[PDB]
Structure 1
Amino acid sequence: CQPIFLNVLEAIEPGVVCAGHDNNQPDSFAALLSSLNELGERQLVHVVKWAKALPGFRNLHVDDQMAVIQYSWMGLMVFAMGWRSFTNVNSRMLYFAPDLVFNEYRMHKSRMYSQCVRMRHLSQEFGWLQITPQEFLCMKALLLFSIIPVDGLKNQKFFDELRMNYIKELDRIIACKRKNPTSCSRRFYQLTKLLDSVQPIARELHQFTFDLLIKSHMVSVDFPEMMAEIISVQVPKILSGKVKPIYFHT
């Protein structure tokens, strides 16, 4: 147990990132979403640094590195948020950032109440399944390799191999506490189901942010440079079916 791999994941895990939201001003759709967008931009910088530090990531073609990050950031961020919410507030609220916590009122004011419900549900799963910090860490890494173009990447072979190895690492983590061969199988099943559950949530958020970007000027919501570029160039590839999540289960 505690292989080199685990040492690495625990070492590169991003720290706390604030949204920069003004909690003194009364909530408003525009302010809440603009802050969420700014948070996304800030978190993206951390996700990029984190990914480049992942074992074997830099071996992928440079265009594939940027591509997987551009396609998987939503799922990665939502999954990490679900974890923060569970550990910080026991899933009572969505802990996007220390300065941007959503209670039911904000979930409503944000105009994405249903999406927040699914996200809070995901947060609860971390408790219902008793997910460990190590399991969380390995699952999150695997999420970076869980969405690619239907026609493949520049060098699919390398990606396929890397993804396989990350799956193997999850196996090791699972086997490192399951004496009985029955609980080990069940666990992998459970975690892959949890991992898959992230995709539909990310898709709904992709749909929502895309629409928001389109009418951003009319509702006065600001989108930082990178966010606007990725949501108008990469996200549509996902929504149009050119890029799809890799599901474990059908």
Structure 2
Amino acid sequence: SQPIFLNVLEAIEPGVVCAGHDNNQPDSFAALLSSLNELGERQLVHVVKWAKALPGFRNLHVDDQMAVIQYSWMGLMVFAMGWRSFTNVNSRMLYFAPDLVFNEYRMHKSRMYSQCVRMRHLSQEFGWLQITPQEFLCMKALLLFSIIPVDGLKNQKFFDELRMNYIKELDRIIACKKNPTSCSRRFYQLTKLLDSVQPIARELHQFTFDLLIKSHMVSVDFPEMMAEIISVQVPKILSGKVKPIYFHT
């Protein structure tokens, strides 16, 4: 039986996105963070177009569609950037975009060196675990469905069924074989990898929120869409109204 789910994921996977960073200016806090915010804005456009093409996604209430996107973009973009870093520079640097690659100096200058280190460990996991492109696509799709309000969504029922289905699809393409233990071990590793994305996203969420607050004082520009989500949705996560869905406790 010819697969379909994976055909779709591979087909809709977003292409290359540039930050628009001018690599001629010195590496300053203001210049680096302003370019990261622009990349986030451009990437948010692809995240939306991508999500809309995902199987079952349009069957969610429009407001729930907005919500999962507003809540999970950080995790999605970090996971993807870790994959690019792993495949383009063997996780040696953070490959945010072709025109915005962070080396050690930029990690320090960004004032988020610790968070960059944690992102680099994430990227390296793709190597340590030997994550296949298929496993990567399925895990990334599941991240879209990994954060919701504690009060639930407008149509929680359908969301829970869609989430379930994306889990079964992940289970189906895990790299294993005559050895049920290997498959069991593999699923454990992948669920653990997905969970580890959340604490990273949370640090970045805290950082960007604080940055937005003092943006005028540190000369960091926030595009319209990022400004809006960072000032309305991100606080709901930081205040505990919206929480990640973990596999493990």
For residues 105-153 of structure 1, the C-alpha deviation after alignment (integer angstroms, 9 at most, x for no partner) is 1000000000000000000000000000000000000000000000100
Q: Distance in 2 between matches of 1:170 and 1:129?
A: 15
| Structure-1 residue corresponding to 2:215 | 216
Q: Distance in 1 between matches of 2:175 and 2:55?
A: 21
For residues 12-41 of structure 1, the C-alpha deviation after alignment (integer angstroms, 9 at most, x for no partner) is 000000000010111110000000000000
Q: Distance in 2 between matches of 1:92 and 1:184?
A: 30
Q: Distance in 1 between matches of 2:58 and 2:94?
A: 33
Structure 1 position 77, deviation (Å): 0.1
| Structure-2 residue corresponding to 1:22 | 22
Q: Secondary structure at the match of 1:249?
A: coil
Alignment of 1:66-215 (within 5 A): 66-174=66-174, 177=177, 179-215=178-214
> Does structure 1 conserve the Cα–Cα contact (< 8 Å) formed by 2:17 and 2:97?
yes
- Could you tell me which runs of 5 or more consecutive residues in structure 1 were left unpaired when the two chains were aligned: none
Q: Secondary structure at the match of 1:95?
A: strand
> Does structure 1 conserve the Cα–Cα contact (< 8 Å) formed by 2:94 and 2:102?
yes
Structure 1 position 176, deviation (Å): 6.5
Structure 1 position 212, deviation (Å): 0.1
Structure 1 position 221, deviation (Å): 0.2
For residues 174-219 of structure 1, the C-alpha deviation after alignment (integer angstroms, 9 at most, x for no partner) is 1664x41011000000000000000000000000000000000000
Q: Distance in 1 between matches of 2:175 and 2:120?
A: 29
Q: Distance in 2 between matches of 1:196 and 1:176?
A: 21
Alignment of 1:26-41 (within 5 A): 26-41=26-41
Change (3 A) 1:80 1:184: same
Q: What is the Cα-based RMSD across aligned positions, in Å?
A: 0.8
Q: Secondary structure at the match of 2:226?
A: helix
Q: Distance in 1 between matches of 2:30 and 2:175?
A: 47
Q: Secondary structure at the match of 1:175?
A: coil
Q: Distance in 2 between matches of 1:109 and 1:176?
A: 42
For residues 47-79 of structure 1, the C-alpha deviation after alignment (integer angstroms, 9 at most, x for no partner) is 000000000000000000000000000000000
Change (3 A) 1:82 1:175: closer
Q: Secondary structure at the match of 2:148?
A: strand
For residues 210-250 of structure 1, the C-alpha deviation after alignment (integer angstroms, 9 at most, x for no partner) is 00000000000000000000000000000000000000000
Q: Distance in 1 between matches of 2:179 and 2:63?
A: 43
Q: Distance in 1 between matches of 2:26 and 2:104?
A: 15
Q: Secondary structure at the match of 1:244?
A: strand
| Structure-1 residue corresponding to 2:227 | 228
- Could you tell me which runs of 5 or more consecutive residues in structure 2 were left unpaired when the two chains were aligned: none
Q: Secondary structure at the match of 1:81?
A: helix
> Does structure 1 conserve the Cα–Cα contact (< 8 Å) formed by 2:175 and 2:186?
no
TM-score (norm 1): 0.98
Q: Distance in 2 between matches of 1:158 and 1:233?
A: 25
Aligned residues with identical type, % of pairs: 100
> Does structure 1 conserve the Cα–Cα contact (< 8 Å) formed by 2:150 and 2:241?
yes
| Structure-1 residue corresponding to 2:59 | 59
Structure 1 position 81, deviation (Å): 0.2
Q: Distance in 2 between matches of 1:57 and 1:113?
A: 35
